[PDB]
Design a protein around this ligand. Sequence first.
Ligand SMILES: COc1ccc(C(=O)NO)cc1NC(=O)c1ccc(Cl)cc1Cl
Ligand SMILES: [K+]
Ligand SMILES: [K+]
Ligand SMILES: [Zn+2]
Length: 387
Amino acid sequence: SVGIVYGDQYRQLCCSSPKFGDRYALVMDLINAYKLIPELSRVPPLQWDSPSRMYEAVTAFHSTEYVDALKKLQMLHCEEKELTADDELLMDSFSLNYDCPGFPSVFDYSLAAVQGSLAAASALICRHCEVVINWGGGWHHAKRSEASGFCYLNDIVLAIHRLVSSTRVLYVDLDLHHGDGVEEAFWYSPRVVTFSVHHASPGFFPGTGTWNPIFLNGAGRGRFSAFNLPLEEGINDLDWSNAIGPILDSLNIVIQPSYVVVQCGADCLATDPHRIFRLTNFYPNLSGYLYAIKKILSWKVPTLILGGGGYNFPDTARLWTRVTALTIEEVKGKKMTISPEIPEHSYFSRYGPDFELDIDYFPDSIQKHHRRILEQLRNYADLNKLI
Ligand SMILES: COc1ccc(C(=O)NO)cc1NC(=O)c1ccc(Cl)cc1Cl
Ligand SMILES: [K+]
Ligand SMILES: [K+]
Ligand SMILES: [Zn+2]
């Protein structure tokens, strides 16, 4: 089956943050509006037996002190008094500031994504599902003891850790931004191969995933196991597809992963406020995203599909609705017919004034990168005695 993470409480928490507002509600209600929910197996977010069990789960990656600080940030934001100078210094020491502010639900919001993606991983491990989707997850920037890029807890790292502790995982990061937190977590780990394609340029967040000059690619027994493809602004569906397709296929052939984890941040869409890449959600009766997901699913490897960035909420819903339909089609072999017109539902008016499923958009260095990545993959196979 195809699983999808949702729940009443989960929805409320995923909609409680200042940055992402009600995006998750638009996403799930558009999926529902197109009658996809009956095709899908609801995966309930993970809940724990005790505080100690929750802390044990989260501090598989994060430090206890950071988890403590994040919980304290929530408490402090639930009372009306300003932070003390000492508490400001504490939060600053974990980068719980500026891009990663406190708010009254910051811990519950952050934890919910972890609950969803851990449950998604268990559903794959027990083979209840061949693919699980979590549009509430995908927070790839969070580090062991540092919030970053509005990522407070790295649900992806925790999900991948659960998978490898059940084995090789291929992590594919389609976000506009470099997947630095996940890459770092598994920097010394050859069994989790990470691959991020992203924009990179001087001063662009977060700065990594590019010439450092040479490309760093892991360390210790993890050498050659972190792959990166930085791309210049303006790339369209076809050029992005041609850039990553051979990489994806070669990584699957050489690594033979037991699981694939895909981060599908929607901020590469031409209509995202970043206005960096020119990807679409187009699906001829072709979106770079849909090209990549269809390719990954053709491998028939259990797959976790996560969200991430995406700051045009209706267009992110438009993309992830199509990704969800495509996953149903590829996994179940069942035709999905999505009307070109947005169906009437609670958020119908957010898709105006045209109310189409298509987003409103009219559409050498890469060869160098491919040679470099092929060599690195050769080096990775040699180091790990792969055939
Ligand atoms: C500091 O900013 C960021 C950090 C991480 C990620 C992201 O998407 N992670 O992958 C995105 C942003 N950028 C944004 O907030 C952002 C930037 C420009 C505009 Cl116009 C709107 C937004 Cl919401
Ligand atoms: K990326
Ligand atoms: K790695
Ligand atoms: Zn992003």
